[PDB]
């Protein structure tokens, strides 16, 4: 877990950038999927192009050897590819006229368990369908029309996708789910199905964050951390985000009773990694002065296209399992309603790594 702290800081760097450009749109991305994708691309990069990518991923190249970086990602992908669905993959698409280096192809297939392909970019409309078909077939139809524009001069494209529909270890009762108002702001109200169960949760009010912190667990040894900011404290919560937040309450075995109002969510996020990671300091690999000599030996190459799409869905529970033995509330429990915008994190317990991070301003987006 040597690379775990780097991913956490990279996630908060990525989130603070996305929240900076838009304060009224949903945010949802996978820090692990993006970092694994561009670390794989680093194996075909050299000199400053290689160093920019790793430095932009919050890796201190003077303190962590390059092998440990790539080895840490391989161990992380091994844990993911074992129970949780987590249908993820990265596709490298290159012009059929380029002589791809075999060492890069071997490392992509072996180290990162990823696939490369050759496609004719002369037909923009045809290539877009072909790329969107491999993603659609890979996701079993979960992700469609991932690519919506291919330039006529495209010669190299990267697509990163991830899908997660998780089942709660402690489920919800569909009969108790009710439609309630979600207040996106002072003037906007959306009617959303609100999952509601009274019971005991790993829920607590953190004065440092000025937010309610709820941790509910998914089957697959992955835990979801929900942050409900207090009134006017959303920015304060974002300011005070640090890796200690992830680990602070994951170890808590204590439970407190509360009436929970959590809306059903189906959230998607599509980002142009070229623009976003360009704001984080990764620019050379996208420019004409790139060093992708580890991919093609004899021709100038640059990464023309880089897209990331993350899709997540959670419901009340599928098929019914067994009841969870419950401690009946002996008193009036506090009511924690997620009727206002909130921040959430998905953490893989074994690696303590961020799978998904996002902010929900409208459940119906």
CA quadruple 280, 285, 287, 290: dihedral sign: positive
Pairing of strands 87-95, 115-119: parallel
The b/e string for 126-151 (b: 16+ C-beta within 10 A; e otherwise) is ebbeebbebbbebbeebbeebbeebe
For 55-83, what is the HEC assignment? HHCCCCCCCCCHHHHHHHHHHHHHHHCCC
d(CA 294, CA 117): 16
d(CA 200, CA 326): 8
Distance of CA 362 to the CA centre of its chain: 18
CATH number of residue 222's parent domain = 2.30.39.10
Residue 172 included in any domain:
no
The reply to whether 235 and 279 lie within a common domain is no
The reply to whether 303 and 279 lie within a common domain is yes
d(CA 320, CA 314): 15
The reply to whether 295 and 238 lie within a common domain is no
User: What are the residues whose beta carbons fall under 8 Å from the beta carbon of 252, sequence distance 6 or more?
Assistant: 202, 204, 215
The structure tokens listed for 53 are: 């990518």
The reply to whether 63 and 156 lie within a common domain is yes
Pairing of strands 305-314, 156-166: parallel
The reply to whether 152 and 121 lie within a common domain is yes
Method used to determine the 3D structure: X-ray
d(CA 302, CA 151): 13
How many other CB atoms are found less than 10 A from the CB of residue 107?
17
For the chain, what is the HEC assignment? CCCHHHHHHHHHHHHHHHHHHCCCCCEEECHHHHHHHHHHHHCCCCHHHHHHHHHHCCCCCCCCCHHHHHHHHHHHHHHHCCCCCCEEEEEEEEECCCCECHHHHHHHHHCCCCEEEEECCCCHHHHHHHHHHHHHHHCCCCCCCCCCCCCCCCCEEEEEEEEEEECECCCCCHHHCEEEEEECCCCCEEEEEEEEEEEEEEEEEECCCCEEEEEEEECCCEEEEEEEECCCCHHHHHHCCCHHHHHHCCCCCCCEEEEEEEECEEEEEEEEHHHHHHHCCCCHHHCCCCCCCCCECCCCCCCCEEEEEEEEEECCCCCCCCCCCCCCCCCCCCEEECCCCEEEEEEECCCCEEEEEEEECCCCC
The reply to whether 82 and 231 lie within a common domain is no
Domain extent for 228 = 178-263
CATH number of residue 56's parent domain = 3.30.497.10
Q: Which residues pair with 259 in a beta bridge?
A: 198, 335
The reply to whether 59 and 203 lie within a common domain is no
- Resolution given for this structure, in angstroms: 2.9
117, burial (CB in 10 Å: exposed 0-12, middle 13-18, buried 19+): middle
As for how many domains the chain has, the answer is 2
The structure tokens listed for 179 are: 């439609």
The structure tokens listed for 13 are: 């760097």
The reply to whether 259 and 272 lie within a common domain is no
Residue 333 included in any domain:
no
The reply to whether 64 and 153 lie within a common domain is yes
């Amino acid at each position: 877990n040597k690379i775990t702290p780097n991913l956490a800081e990279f996630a908060f760097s990525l989130y603070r950038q996305l929240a900076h450009q838009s304060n009224s749109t949903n945010i949802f991305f996978s820090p692990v999927s993006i970092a694994t994708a561009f670390a794989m691309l680093s194996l075909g990069t050299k000199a400053d192009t290689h160093d920019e990518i790793l430095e932009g991923l919050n890796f201190n190249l003077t303190e962590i050897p390059e092998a440990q970086i790539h080895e840490g990602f391989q161990e992380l992908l091994r844990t993911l590819n074992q129970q949780l669905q987590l249908t993820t993959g990265n596709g490298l698409f290159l012009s059929e006229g380029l002589k791809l280096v075999d060492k890069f192809l071997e490392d992509v297939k072996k180290l990162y368990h990823s696939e490369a392909f050759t496609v004719n970019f002369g037909d923009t409309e045809e290539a877009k369908k072909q790329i969107n078909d491999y993603v659609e077939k890979g996701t079993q139809g979960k992700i469609v029309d991932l690519v919506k524009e291919l330039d006529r001069d495209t010669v190299f494209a990267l697509v990163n996708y991830i899908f997660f529909k998780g089942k709660w270890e402690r489920p919800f009762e569909v009969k108790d789910t009710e439609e309630e108002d979600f207040h996106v702001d002072q003037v906007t109200t959306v009617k959303v199905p609100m999952m509601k169960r009274l019971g005991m949760f790993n829920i607590q009010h953190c004065k440092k964050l000025s937010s309610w912190v709820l941790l509910m667990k998914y089957l697959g040894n992955a835990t979801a951390i929900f942050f409900l900011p207090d009134e006017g404290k959303l920015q304060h919560l974002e300011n005070e985000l640090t890796h200690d937040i992830i680990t602070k309450f994951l170890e808590n075995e204590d439970r407190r009773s509360a009436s929970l109002h959590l809306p059903k969510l189906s959230i998607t996020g599509t980002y142009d990694l070229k623009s976003v990671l360009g704001q984080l300091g990764i620019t050379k690999v996208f420019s004409n002065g790139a060093d992708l000599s580890g991919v093609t030996e004899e021709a100038p190459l640059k990464l023309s296209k880089a897209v990331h799409k993350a899709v997540l869905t959670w419901d009340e529970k599928e098929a019914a399992g067994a009841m969870f033995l419950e401690a009946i509330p002996m008193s009036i429990p506090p009511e924690v309603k997620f009727n206002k915008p909130f921040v959430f994190l998905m953490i893989e317990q074994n690696t303590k790594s961020p799978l998904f991070m996002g902010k929900v301003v409208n459940p119906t987006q």
